[PDB]
Amino acid sequence: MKTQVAIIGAGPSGLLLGQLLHKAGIDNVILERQTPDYVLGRIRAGVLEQGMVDLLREAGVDRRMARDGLVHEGVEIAFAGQRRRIDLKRLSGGKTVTVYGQTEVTRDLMEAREACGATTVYQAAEVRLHDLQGERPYVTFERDGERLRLDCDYIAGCDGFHGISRQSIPAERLKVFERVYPFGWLGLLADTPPVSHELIYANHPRGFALCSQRSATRSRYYVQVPLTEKVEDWSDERFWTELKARLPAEVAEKLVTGPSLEKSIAPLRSFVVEPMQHGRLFLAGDAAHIVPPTGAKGLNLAASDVSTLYRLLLKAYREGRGELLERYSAICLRRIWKAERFSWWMTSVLHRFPDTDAFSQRIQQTELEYYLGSEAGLATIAENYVGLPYE
Amino acid sequence: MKTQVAIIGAGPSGLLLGQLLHKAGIDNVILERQTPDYVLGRIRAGVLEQGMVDLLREAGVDRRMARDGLVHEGVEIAFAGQRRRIDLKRLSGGKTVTVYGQTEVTRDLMEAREACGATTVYQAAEVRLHDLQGERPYVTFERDGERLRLDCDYIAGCDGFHGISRQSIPAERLKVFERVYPFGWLGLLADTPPVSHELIYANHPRGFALCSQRSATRSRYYVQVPLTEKVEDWSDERFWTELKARLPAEVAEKLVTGPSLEKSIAPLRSFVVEPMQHGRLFLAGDAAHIVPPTGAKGLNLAASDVSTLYRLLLKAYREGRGELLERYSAICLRRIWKAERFSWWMTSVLHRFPDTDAFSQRIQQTELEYYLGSEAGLATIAENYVGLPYE
Ligand SMILES: Cc1cc2nc3c(=O)[nH]c(=O)nc-3n(C[C@@H](O)[C@H](O)[C@H](O)COP(=O)(O)OP(=O)(O)OC[C@H]3O[C@@H](n4cnc5c(N)ncnc54)[C@H](O)[C@@H]3O)c2cc1C
Ligand SMILES: Cc1cc2nc3c(=O)[nH]c(=O)nc-3n(C[C@@H](O)[C@H](O)[C@H](O)COP(=O)(O)OP(=O)(O)OC[C@H]3O[C@@H](n4cnc5c(N)ncnc54)[C@H](O)[C@@H]3O)c2cc1C
């Protein structure tokens, strides 16, 4: 078989890229290691930047989002016995963010793809990439036990952190930047009303806590935990008690608790690889970079990489301007580094780090006081949180 | 002998406090360990916030400053092959800073004090403080070999980092926060025209460099150096060559060099003690806190502590409101911590730290790019640099 663009991975990155390309008349095949059900089982992110919202509308997959998504104009930060609200709309010049689950976004895209008849091969095992620096690269994989070959012009690696695509680039061509945090986030999804209409990030002496939501009757909470903890050590009862201990009393008393629909621990990490391409292979999303979830940039960076790759492929196919594809990494990296800096800052000011001396604790508190108390300070948070403009 | 306020130390803190109190009719005696000449030999700071400028005018010691001081509306930051100017006046809402040497400020104050006839005892050896928690505290010292006693109501410890006053508070009553940096600054004073009309802070791979001035024919430069270096290892020739290697070529080529008038190495440190008082003793300036010079806040924080202490003593003496003095530490610490946070930030983004991994170097560069490229980012630098308003 042959196609124009081969896409490895059927998470939001690959599905979004595949839908945009399909609509533009550029044929693409998506290869996914897992089953549709397995992909839809992942909870993950819940905050979308306007750029991604617009991209979804452009891919023609925004009906349910427009209907069910919640537009937020602010967010709160609680620390040292106080709650500070950042008016994102006012401080960013009218921009806002939309709360709509990643699971929902993925489901919307999967439906759209199924309906349009574009090619998607689930359970594509042992995917391998070949002749990346040739005129005609190709992908091989096994279906049922048979090894198939897919010829193409370009390959988009949208296979996440553990995908085969980043592994397929000669190690000596890549420059990796990484930072692992000494803690993870224990998240819990519950069919209960959110404790607030906006998100509450809380820096507490016992550790970080985050109150989020998915809808009016679905909440998503997180608590910072050491990397040594295992989810089976945390009953729902234990989680709720801990969450409450980390929240302002007035918030903790309004909290409606209930049984978890999902509960898991995800460790924190920062990761960037440079460049993000090699020959006919272009990396996008988690395959190229990782940000701690504190700033809600993961899914959002996948969106901007895809937007950039899609527009460059359009120039290549529609206008015969293939040379522009060489600029992919430079364009994406500029946005990526700024989002990595913000996520890192967000993480350092909201979490409790092990082995912190007195000076550092005081500086962490002063960072909060300064940034949340100055108009210019609030503005730096807001503009970064709503998301810097696409290039 | 007896006085109302005993002041330990004749650097800018004590002299400024003594002049303000004198003018307000509150008698004060200043005790200094060194000679007038030794004090005037210190070069140190060169940038004054408007608050300090106004305080000097209030103490009636601003003629020469108004005449010789240089008002700066901006400052530049050079990094990764580029020079970025921060328009302080525009970004701070019309505020500026004044370049007038600390040596000059000290000389102006010493003259004013000498002329008004207020008491100053130089070469006051082995100063000791007594009955700090009594109704009537006192200071003892040796002059000529004779041990004298000075009775007073209050004692202001303006004796710097190594003064006897902070040492006189029961250690268990103080909470210290400290951070030592792995480098020092090698400074050089030269009788040459400045390379720029505004300051240039430079982050270079070889290390930090700063181009400052004292007048139109007097420059002050600094270069970051390891704590293992000794000034005798640095000839003028070696310094100039190193400075040039750390500056943008166009700047380096305009540089007029010459023999040093002064040259020395000063290590970097952050230090805060809480509280800043004990009984009838109040600490001010370097006796209570230290900031790395990167943000030019040392002399400026001494000024705000003195302004706060002076105004509280005025209420106590003029209005009989002695209770207000209990609020001294709380008021000062709020400003101190914000200035410590800024000086720390300034230091971390402009210096080259030993043992920095790839991720951190990239984040340091991105911090610069973000802050110097965003209106909100520039504003956070400007408002902090001109100095936050006195409380
Ligand atoms: C465990 C986890 C929890 C997260 N939680 C949060 C959160 O709480 N908040 C937040 O803001 N962000 C969170 N994120 C970030 C998340 O939103 C990601 O940024 C987002 O899923 C990235 O989307 P993709 O790049 O499409 O990658 P994804 O990882 O979502 O998808 C990649 C796809 O490639 C497939 N694939 C893998 N290897 C393959 C191969 N060899 N061949 C074929 N297919 C292959 C995978 O099966 C997967 O379907 C989380 C991420 C993870 C990994
Ligand atoms: C070596 C050095 C270099 C510096 N360089 C810079 C720079 O380049 N840029 C910048 O922005 N800042 C710099 N600073 C900071 C500087 O500006 C200080 O913040 C400022 O001098 C503090 O003023 P005071 O609190 O009055 O203390 P000071 O240290 O100036 O004065 C305290 C006085 O108390 C006296 N004293 C000490 N112990 C005594 C005792 N037991 N009895 C009696 N008298 C006693 C001392 O002799 C001294 O005269 C530097 C500081 C130092 C120490």
Relative to beta strand A125-130, strand A138-143 is antiparallel
Q: Which residues on neighbouring strands pair with residue A32, listed in sequence order?
A: A122
Both structure tokens of B109: 């104050």
Among B176, B373, B377, B172, CA closest to B278 = B172
Among A235, A240, A298, A304, CA closest to A269 = A298
Both structure tokens of B205: 């791979």
Long-range contacts of B225-231 (CB under 8 A, 24+ apart): B225/B183, B225/B184, B225/B185, B225/B186, B225/B265, B226/B182, B226/B183, B226/B184, B226/B354, B227/B182, B227/B183, B227/B184, B227/B267, B229/B184, B229/B186, B229/B265, B230/B265, B231/B186, B231/B263, B231/B264, B231/B265
CA of A223 to the centre of ligand 1 (A): 21
A259 included as an active-site residue: no
Residues in chain B: 391
Return the ∠ at Cα B317 (arms to B316 and B319), rounded to 5°: 70
Burial (CB < 10 A; 0-12, 13-18, 19+), residue A305, is buried
Is residue B390 within 8 angstroms of chain A, CB to CB? no
Among B85, B72, B56, CA closest to B215 = B72
- Rounded CA-CA distance A6/A22 in Å is 12
Exposure class string for B274-300: b at 16+ Cβ within 10 A, else e = bbbbbbbbbbbbbbbbbbbbbbbbbbb
Does residue A275 have a cis bond before it (omega within 30 degrees)?
A: yes
CB of B18 closer than 8 Å to CB of B285: no
Q: Which residues on neighbouring strands pair with residue A48, listed in sequence order?
A: A98
Relative to beta strand A260-274, strand A175-190 is antiparallel
Q: What separation in angstroms does the CA of A225 have from each of A228, A244, A361?
A: 8, 15, 18
φ, ψ dihedrals at B267, nearest 5°: -75, 155
Q: Determine the 3-state secondary structure of A122 from DSSP.
A: strand
Strands of the sheet containing A218-225, edge to edge, are: A82-87, A74-79, A200-202, A209-215, A218-225, A175-190, A260-274, A289-290
Strands of the sheet containing B146-151, edge to edge, are: B125-130, B138-143, B146-151
* Partner-chain contact A340 B363, CB within 8 Å: yes
- Rounded CA-CA distance A95/A73 in Å is 8
**Helix axis angle, A328-350 relative to A358-373, nearest 10°?**
110
Is residue A269 within 8 angstroms of chain B, CB to CB? no
Q: Which residues of A touch B338 (CB under 8 A)?
A: 366, 369-370
B38 included as an active-site residue: no
Task: Please name each of the domains of chain B with its CATH number.
Answer: 1-72+96-180+269-351 (3.50.50.60), 73-95+181-268+352-388 (3.30.9.10)
Q: Determine the 3-state secondary structure of A312 from DSSP.
A: helix
Q: Determine the 3-state secondary structure of A181 from DSSP.
A: strand
The secondary structure of residue A325, as a DSSP letter, is G
Relative to beta strand A281-283, strand A154-157 is parallel
Among B1, B58, B77, B134, CA closest to B294 = B77
Best mutation site among B297, B366, B367, B375 for testing chain A: the one with the most A CBs within 10 Å? Answer: B366
CB of B106 closer than 8 Å to CB of B11: yes
Does residue B275 have a cis bond before it (omega within 30 degrees)?
A: yes
Among A75, A176, A41, CA closest to A384 = A75
A385 included as an active-site residue: yes
Return the ∠ at Cα A343 (arms to A45 and A108), rounded to 5°: 20
CB of A174 closer than 8 Å to CB of A289: no
Exposure class string for A266-292: b at 16+ Cβ within 10 A, else e = eebebbbbbbbbbbbbbbbbbbbbbbb
A356's CB contacts (< 8 A; 6+ apart) are A364
CB of A2 closer than 8 Å to CB of A119: no
Among A5, A133, A25, A337, CA closest to B80 = A337
Q: Which residues of A touch B380 (CB under 8 A)?
A: 374, 376-377, 380
CB of B127 closer than 8 Å to CB of B140: yes
Pocket, ligand 1, Cβ cutoff 6 A: A 8-14, 31-34, 39, 44-45, 102, 124, 127, 158-160, 162-164, 187, 266, 285-286, 293, 296, 298-299, 302
Q: How was this structure determined?
A: X-ray
* Partner-chain contact A383 B369, CB within 8 Å: no
- Rounded CA-CA distance B114/B124 in Å is 17
CA A371 to chain centre: 25
Pocket, ligand 2, Cβ cutoff 6 A: B 8-14, 31-34, 39, 44-45, 102, 124, 127, 158-160, 162-164, 187, 266, 285-286, 293, 296, 298-299, 302
Return the ∠ at Cα B57 (arms to B332 and B211), rounded to 5°: 75
Give strand ranges (E) for A10-130: 28-32, 47-48, 70-72, 74-79, 82-87, 97-99, 119-122, 125-130
**Helix axis angle, A12-23 relative to A102-116, nearest 10°?**
40
- Rounded CA-CA distance A375/B203 in Å is 28
Backbone gaps in chain A, preceding residues (C–N over 2.5 A): none
- Rounded CA-CA distance B231/B181 in Å is 18
CB of B51 closer than 8 Å to CB of B390: yes
> What is the least distance, in Å, from the CA of A336 to any CA of chain B?
10
Among B353, B335, B367, CA closest to B180 = B353
Per the annotation, binding residues of B for FAD are: 13, 32, 42-47, 102, 286, 299-300
A72 included as an active-site residue: yes
Both structure tokens of B51: 């608050």
Q: Determine the 3-state secondary structure of A249 from DSSP.
A: helix
Number of continuous H segments (helices) and E segments (strands) in chain A = 13, 20
Q: Determine the 3-state secondary structure of A121 from DSSP.
A: strand
B275 included as an active-site residue: no
φ, ψ dihedrals at A16, nearest 5°: -65, -45
- Rounded CA-CA distance B276/B284 in Å is 8
Both structure tokens of B164: 């006897």
CB of B292 closer than 8 Å to CB of B347: yes
Q: What is the DSSP string of B336-361?
A: HHHHHHHHHHHHHHHSPPSS--HHHH
CB of B269 closer than 8 Å to CB of B179: yes
CB of A356 closer than 8 Å to CB of A203: no
Among B359, B203, B54, CA closest to A291 = B359
Q: Which of A72, A204, A289, A351 is catalytic?
A: A72
- Rounded CA-CA distance A19/A56 in Å is 9
- Rounded CA-CA distance B306/B315 in Å is 14
Best mutation site among B345, B359, B378 for testing chain A: the one with the most A CBs within 10 Å? Answer: B359
A33's CB contacts (< 8 A; 6+ apart) are A9, A123, A124, A125, A127, A159
Number of continuous H segments (helices) and E segments (strands) in chain B = 13, 20
Is residue A380 within 8 angstroms of chain B, CB to CB? yes
Q: What is the DSSP string of B52-119?
A: HHHHHHHTT--HHHHHH-EEESEEEEEETTEEEEEEHHHHHTS--EEE--HHHHHHHHHHHHHHHT-E
Handedness of CA A175, A181, A182, A185 (dihedral sign): negative
Q: Determine the 3-state secondary structure of A103 from DSSP.
A: helix
- Tally Cβ neighbours within 10 Å of residue B267: 13
- Rounded CA-CA distance A172/A206 in Å is 43
- Tally Cβ neighbours within 10 Å of residue A41: 11
Among the partner residues A357, A369, A379, nearest to B376 by beta-carbon distance = A379
* Partner-chain contact B175 A272, CB within 8 Å: no
Both structure tokens of B269: 């440190």
- Rounded CA-CA distance A232/A236 in Å is 10
CB of A262 closer than 8 Å to CB of A189: yes
The secondary structure of residue A390, as a DSSP letter, is P
- Rounded CA-CA distance B235/B213 in Å is 20
Tell me the CB-side half-sphere exposure of residue A390, using CA atoms within 13 A: 18
φ, ψ dihedrals at A380, nearest 5°: -65, -35
Chain B residue with minimum CA distance to A272: B359
Q: Which residues of B touch A374 (CB under 8 A)?
A: 380, 383
The secondary structure of residue B262, as a DSSP letter, is E
Among A172, A127, A170, A126, CA closest to A152 = A127
CA A344 to chain centre: 15
Q: What is the DSSP string of B2-19?
A: B-SEEEE--SHHHHHHHH
Place of tokens 């209409």: A197
Chain B residue with minimum CA distance to A177: B359
- Rounded CA-CA distance B271/A291 in Å is 33
CB of B131 closer than 8 Å to CB of B105: no
Residue A45 assigned as binding residue: yes
Q: What separation in angstroms does the CA of A200 have from each of A248, A250, A345, B142, B287?
A: 10, 13, 17, 61, 40
Residue A191 assigned as binding residue: no
- Rounded CA-CA distance B270/B343 in Å is 9
A268's CB contacts (< 8 A; 6+ apart) are A180, A181, A183, A184, A185, A292, A293, A294, A347
The DSSP H or E segment spanning A58 is helix A50-58
Q: Which atom of ligand 2 is nearest to the CA of B161?
A: 29
φ, ψ dihedrals at A381, nearest 5°: -70, -50
Strands of the sheet containing A97-99, edge to edge, are: A47-48, A97-99, A70-72
- Rounded CA-CA distance B45/B285 in Å is 13
- Rounded CA-CA distance A124/A117 in Å is 18
* Partner-chain contact B369 A338, CB within 8 Å: yes
The DSSP H or E segment spanning B167 is helix B164-167
Residue A189 assigned as binding residue: no
Q: What is the resolution of this structure in A?
A: 2.1
Nearest listed ligand to the Cα of residue B99: 2
Alpha carbon dihedral A287, A290, A294, A297, in 10-degree steps, equals -50
Q: Determine the 3-state secondary structure of A1 from DSSP.
A: coil
- Rounded CA-CA distance A180/A270 in Å is 6
The secondary structure of residue A2, as a DSSP letter, is B
